[PDB]
Amino acid sequence: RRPKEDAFTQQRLAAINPVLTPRTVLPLYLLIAVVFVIVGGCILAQNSKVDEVTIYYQDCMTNATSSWSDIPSEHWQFVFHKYKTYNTAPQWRFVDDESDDFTKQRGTCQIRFTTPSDMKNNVYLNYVLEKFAANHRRYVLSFSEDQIRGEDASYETVHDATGINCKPLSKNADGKIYYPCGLIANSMFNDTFPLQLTNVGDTSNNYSLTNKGINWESDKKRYKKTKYNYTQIAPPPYWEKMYPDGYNETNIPDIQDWEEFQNWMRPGAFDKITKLIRINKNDTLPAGEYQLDIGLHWPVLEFNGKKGIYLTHGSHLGGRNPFLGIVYLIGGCICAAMALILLTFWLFGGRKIADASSLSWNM
Amino acid sequence: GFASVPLIVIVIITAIKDGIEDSRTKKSRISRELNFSVILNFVLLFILCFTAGIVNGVYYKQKPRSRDYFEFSTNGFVSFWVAVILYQSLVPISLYISVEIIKTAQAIFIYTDVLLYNAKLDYPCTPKSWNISDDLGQIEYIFSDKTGTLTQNVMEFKKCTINGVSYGRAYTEALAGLRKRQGVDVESEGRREKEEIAKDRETMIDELRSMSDNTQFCPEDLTFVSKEIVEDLKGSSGDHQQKCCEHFLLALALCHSVLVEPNKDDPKKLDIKAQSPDESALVSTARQLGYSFVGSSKSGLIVEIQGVQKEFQVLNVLEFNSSRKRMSCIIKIPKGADSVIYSRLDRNDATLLEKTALHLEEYATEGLRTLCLAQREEYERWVKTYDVAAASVTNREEELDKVTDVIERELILLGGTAIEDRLQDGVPDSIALLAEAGIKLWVLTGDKVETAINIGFSCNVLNNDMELLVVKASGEDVSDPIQVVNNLVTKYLREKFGMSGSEEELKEAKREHGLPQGNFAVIIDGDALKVALNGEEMRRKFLLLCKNCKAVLCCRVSPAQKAAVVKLVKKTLDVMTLAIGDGSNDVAMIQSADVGVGIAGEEGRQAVMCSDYAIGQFRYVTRLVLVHGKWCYKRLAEMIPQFFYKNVIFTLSLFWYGIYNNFDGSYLFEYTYLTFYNLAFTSVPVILLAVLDQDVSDTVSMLVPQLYRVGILRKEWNQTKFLWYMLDGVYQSVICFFFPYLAYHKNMVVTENGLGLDHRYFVGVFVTAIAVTSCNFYVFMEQYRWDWFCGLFICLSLAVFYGWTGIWTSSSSSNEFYKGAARVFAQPAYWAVLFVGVLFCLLPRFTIDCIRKIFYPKDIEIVREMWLRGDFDLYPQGYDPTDP
Ligand SMILES: *[C@@H]1O[C@H](CO)[C@@H](O[C@@H]2O[C@H](CO)[C@@H](O[C@H]3O[C@H](CO)[C@@H](O)[C@H](O)[C@@H]3O)[C@H](O)[C@H]2NC(C)=O)[C@H](O)[C@H]1NC(C)=O
Ligand SMILES: *[C@@H]1O[C@H](CO)[C@@H](O[C@@]2(O)O[C@H](CO)[C@@H](O)[C@H](O)[C@H]2NC(C)=O)[C@H](O)[C@H]1NC(C)=O
Ligand SMILES: *[C@@H]1O[C@H](CO)[C@@H](O[C@@H]2O[C@H](CO)[C@@H](O)[C@H](O)[C@H]2NC(C)=O)[C@H](O)[C@H]1NC(C)=O
Ligand SMILES: *[C@@H]1O[C@H](CO)[C@@H](O[C@@H]2O[C@H](CO)[C@@H](O)[C@H](O)[C@H]2NC(C)=O)[C@H](O)[C@H]1NC(C)=O
Ligand SMILES: CC(C)CCC[C@@H](C)[C@H]1CC[C@H]2[C@@H]3CC=C4C[C@@H](O)CC[C@]4(C)[C@H]3CC[C@]12C
Ligand SMILES: CC(C)CCC[C@@H](C)[C@H]1CC[C@H]2[C@@H]3CC=C4C[C@@H](O)CC[C@]4(C)[C@H]3CC[C@]12C
């Protein structure tokens, strides 16, 4: 018969009509401006006191000498807030390796840098890569979520799977299933990093860098130890220098307790890849000169790509990036400027708020 | 199965919602503009995918990048296709199902309205079509009907002519029309009129209580107010006037064709049934006069009154025929206009009867339903000719004409009626509201045109300052009608407007959208209209003439005539037309309009079934057009650009990731964000806006009806607004992508512990958070009123985004996050990016809105400022000016 009631069947809900009167806009454009400038300065000040050491060593094999020599100013970038003019050009030294027959990348780059300040109790040494394309469509889908999960997936489950499957690197010419399959695991950054920052001045106390805990612990709930039988799997086409005899009863890598692999199996979204490779969560890194021994294996000059180390204590908003503070300050300043312009319009020429004589029919 | 299930189940729930609120083919204009906007969105998608394919090919034909070392022109085609698969949510089927949900909800909200439900006959507003509700918010023309829509079709006997003398006392609406047209103070004499009718009816009811036991029903149906007849029938002229009024009462109580059968369920109440209301009014006013009809019978009319017994068997009943409107029947002792009975006289006798003819002119003053009753009062010859003429040959017409010409000449008048049809409760206020809203309403009246214009002046369709361009062109007297109608229309168009031109003005008015200025009035009759809509040039000429502000009356119209009028105003000069009406002719009038409202009036519900809406009284159309119409129109006009903007803000953001990655075809978002964004993340806020957003309260939208002029002028929804929302979506997508990227761009270690974000899925979480928050806050910014339901559901949509990221990632089935929520939502970098990204998405739009509500504020901004100040605060919740 008759309709219902209560203020819902009839659109009579308890509402709030937001009339943007100048007595509510200005208390909003200012409450937003001061908040976005307070956080705009709090972030930019927190970001300013962030030490950072970037050292690109992609040109260490063909531009460094057997003796110590300063790194060209185009590679390294030091940013210490306590020392704004701390050039202190770090040195490097390339010791070749005639045993290794990989001419494109071999030997060892020893980089001696000098930090004039400490890094509080949590030092991250990532490796940065440039001009390495790890975000392409065929690449990022080139892995098997069955081998990562620890299953001994056959060639059908590994190759004939859904969009996420190792299409170009499913099986070798012999007939084995690459255990870490796909362009992702195959193309892994294999430059070996030291487990301790060699102290140049006082070699009695070396700053130890562990490789455990460099990835999320939850990742160990997804990357599980394999269940293969070393008779069906072969190293990826580029892991054949790490496993020249293929696989046997022992040398099968445990991807659960191999956090560099789990870091690399997370493809970098952009053209610059920066993945954590060494961490120190116990000791503050004291000021002084330190040497890092990187075993050059991963070639980058073939595609003009760059590779380097990135040492930092970090921050709460990540590393040192003058964007969040800058954009917060710009947002606050824009809010304040537009509010001043609105106050000018309301003062230097405008209507009464509820001006009934300004309606189109009252003209 | 969870692939494409939600579509079918929502189709079923929409169908069952349509089939639930209905038991107790016409597409709107917004839908066609929606199709065009979808075409434009597809053009944007094609441009995006073409640029993606071009840049991907250029990259593949470039320097030896890192592709050919670690990854091992049909390449352009496959890149274009994977881009189409990437950028495909620009315009999905979600728009065409969300719009249907919106229209269904708006229709069931029109239905469930309590101020549109008529408790008299228990019939709420039942939308016969659930797809045209925004069509009501842009209605420009209303083609009403005087039959039973404006007037309640309840005939009331007011005056009469006994012995050539007028008897009766009633103040009709046409008298008020004369008083308003001549310039008398109307709406003021009503007070003293009521105060005198009070004592008049008081003495009336005292006379009834002192006369008899009043065996009739309760005094609510005692429509007898004219005491003058009862005063003069007793002793004014002695027994002469008594003899005349008794003869009149007998002629009206025995000569009739009403089918009386008092039953269902008690024989106490009367069940007088007749196809014509005039006979029912006559027998009712003869019963209430004092000559009631107690009891019932099958054969004959046995009437006992205080001792007198009346049963005069006629032995033959002459039913009313619609072609001739005449029957020769004289009652033994032991019907239309003057074109059938009059105009046949001796080309010096019967002068007093001629005086009675002048009474017709007095009946032309008030415009009632009148007729003449002339009976001719040696006895054996009468019954002999009766029985020999009752069995004539060839349909009984030749001998009937013979006798009607030889003996039925120069009759004497002994009867005459006068019946009025008053407007429904709240029709003048409704017309005043629809006129203030700028709706040019046409009245397709019926029988008489003089009464039509008088009633139009009685209601608020006619008023002062108007120019009554009378186009009743039937001849020189007040030769061929075509040329004189053409000359009169041209003279009016030339001397009342500056309209030197024929064809250019039609296109000029089509590109004008309609603005009624300079209140005028036009009146057409049957023949002048049937000659006005046939010629192609005459059609546009009459249309340019009838583009006046409010008053366009059309009398003596046929069903096809009014249908063709609605077609002429609809097809030519394309506008939105409403055709409220009731009856069989109004069926054809309705079926050929943009919106057709049907009044549940007479027994025939044909105009209710074959319509779009069905209201009880005519007044409801105001609330159907001024409140619900404008509401749904602005709701759709905001939703559609909101929808396209919220799709752009996501697709363009997925495209911006193609700058990097060289448009190779990798998704920035997870495979399940691409679906849940348009399905669950940002779908409910915009729908609840388009369903529950109120421009202003119903009281404010009826107090300031001129707000409706935003729909008549199409000032709310246009392609400019859609393009502006799409450009805002492009900019906001730029922000939504490049704020998380610029957070990452420096060192890519924005994770608060260096453990490592920057899987493209996590940057996608960043971007999707910014985009979902900006979309919901945008829907809330552009919502006129923030209520307990839409704001709650915007908060709940944000919570759904967050909670389902937390549910999907905290499960091994995600296969690439496994911790995306616990890894992204926990870093302060994420919230720091999100807050400033939302600020930079909402700041330029909110600022342009502020500098618009300050410099060039629309009429709704001013009305809302007044409505917040507390102008419209003296009115209750459910207020409507259309009520007694
Ligand atoms: C570290 O990772 C490197 C990732 O590319 C990897 O480089 C690849 O090494 C393989 C050899 O193992 C090269 O393949 C060469 O040798 C085969 C032998 O049949 C030839 O058929 C090939 O044509 C080619 O000459 C790859 O070309 C090379 N890839 C690149 C981009 O240089 C290193 O081998 C890895 N080193 C260690 C120690 O793990
Ligand atoms: C610290 O790291 C040193 C790296 O050079 C290394 O000490 C050795 O290996 O090298 C020193 C310089 O070449 C030399 O002075 C030491 O005698 C070397 N020690 C040994 C055992 O051969 C050690 O790894 C670290 N040194 C200490 C003292 O812990
Ligand atoms: C499995 O293979 C690995 C390497 O392919 C073997 O490790 C080598 O062992 C020999 C002698 O035990 C050493 O001389 C090499 O230096 C080792 N190489 C490396 C890289 O560690 C391992 O011994 C093999 N295991 C079995 C059981 O045969
Ligand atoms: C920081 O201290 C922790 C223990 O307090 C070290 O963790 C141990 O590391 C050694 C060396 O790899 C392992 O053999 C132990 O099994 C680890 N213990 C635990 C409980 O994990 C960690 O290596 C130290 N980090 C640094 C950089 O010195
Ligand atoms: C209200 C508007 C005008 C504020 C705009 C702020 C502008 C003028 C300032 C604020 C931050 C500045 C930018 C800071 C960083 C960079 C990156 C550098 O590689 C090129 C210059 C560039 C791009 C600067 C250009 C100018 C800049 C964008
Ligand atoms: C120095 C040269 C090589 C830089 C060019 C980089 C190219 C590949 C990238 C960087 C900026 C990108 C453009 C950014 C803006 C737009 C406008 C948009 O509506 C269409 C895509 C388009 C036109 C993009 C096309 C691809 C683009 C031009």
Ligand SMILES: CC(C)CCC[C@@H](C)[C@H]1CC[C@H]2[C@@H]3CC=C4C[C@@H](O)CC[C@]4(C)[C@H]3CC[C@]12C
């Ligand atoms: C007309 C109403 C309905 C919608 C208005 C859309 C307006 C508010 C939107 C759409 C396009 C947007 C602009 C897109 C581009 C830029 C350039 C940038 O450097 C400043 C912001 C600015 C100028 C935006 C301001 C806000 C903007 C103009």
Ligand SMILES: CC(C)CCC[C@@H](C)[C@H]1CC[C@H]2[C@@H]3CC=C4C[C@@H](O)CC[C@]4(C)[C@H]3CC[C@]12C
């Ligand atoms: C300062 C250096 C690092 C920038 C190098 C990348 C430059 C060349 C490319 C990458 C991203 C590109 C921008 C992507 C987005 C937009 C917004 C669009 O509406 C206009 C083009 C514009 C503004 C592009 C300009 C060129 C651009 C900034």
Ligand SMILES: CC(C)CCC[C@@H](C)[C@H]1CC[C@H]2[C@@H]3CC=C4C[C@@H](O)CC[C@]4(C)[C@H]3CC[C@]12C
């Ligand atoms: C291009 C016309 C139509 C509108 C102008 C909008 C300009 C002024 C605004 C809108 C979006 C803004 C861009 C947003 C993101 C980036 C990418 C960053 O790496 C360089 C700055 C840059 C490129 C900004 C430059 C200024 C910008 C392009």
Ligand SMILES: CC(C)CCC[C@@H](C)[C@H]1CC[C@H]2[C@@H]3CC=C4C[C@@H](O)CC[C@]4(C)[C@H]3CC[C@]12C
């Ligand atoms: C006390 C230690 C162990 C907590 C470690 C987890 C911390 C760092 C994470 C987990 C939950 C996160 C919070 C989740 C919600 C918000 C509310 C937002 O408006 C400000 C950021 C803030 C407050 C986040 C800050 C960082 C946070 C507190």
Ligand SMILES: CC(C)CCC[C@@H](C)[C@H]1CC[C@H]2[C@@H]3CC=C4C[C@@H](O)CC[C@]4(C)[C@H]3CC[C@]12C
């Ligand atoms: C507009 C506002 C809400 C942006 C929010 C920025 C938040 C998420 C970021 C910016 C600065 C960050 C804070 C920086 C410093 C500290 C002090 C430390 O002892 C506890 C964590 C705490 C408190 C961080 C919490 C998260 C934080 C407050």
Ligand SMILES: [Mg+2]
């Ligand atoms: Mg009707």
